[PDB]
Design a protein around this ligand. Sequence first.
Ligand SMILES: Nc1ncnc2c1ncn2[C@@H]1O[C@H](COP(=O)(O)OP(=O)(O)OC[C@@H](O)[C@@H](O)[C@@H](O)CO)[C@@H](O)[C@H]1O
Length: 159
Amino acid sequence: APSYRVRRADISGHGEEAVVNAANAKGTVSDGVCRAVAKKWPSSFKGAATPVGTAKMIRADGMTVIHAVGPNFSTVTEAEGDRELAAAYRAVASIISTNNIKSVAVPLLSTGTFSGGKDRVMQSLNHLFTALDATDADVVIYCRDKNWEKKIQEAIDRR
Ligand SMILES: Nc1ncnc2c1ncn2[C@@H]1O[C@H](COP(=O)(O)OP(=O)(O)OC[C@@H](O)[C@@H](O)[C@@H](O)CO)[C@@H](O)[C@H]1O
């Protein structure tokens, strides 16, 4: 069974075996988690382009980087976005289990740039749990907001 905990820290300082980038489909560096990942592991972006709802892994800069493309909720219906968000997290879980990754730092996909202006912390976290429950990985969820940290911790605890 996987273990879940939450850190309020820059994900670029994670202590896990792998990190999930909240990526865009073009594999470009822009504001958000992606900027922190590009600064710390700059060569991890080579050929990282992957369609919405998929994930693409690379070993670069002594790190395993998993580029997961959550939906942009400005560009899909709510139901379409919810399916694509579930798919991105399942693509992450498959890469974790198939590559024998023992621990992973995970941001909440589609809760920032891609949130379409809405609070999607619980939507994103519920898809994260459902997908990563298929793995044996130690999962560390990263956020920057003290309120999010407690929400996430509350949600971890309720389980
Ligand atoms: N350094 C950090 N450490 C820990 N948590 C962080 C972080 N930077 C941002 N976050 C949080 O991670 C979540 C996903 O944000 P993001 O805005 O990065 O994630 P999405 O909403 O999936 O959008 C991805 C796009 O921004 C895409 O173009 C990429 O360029 C960006 O990733 C948001 O809740 C942010 O508050």
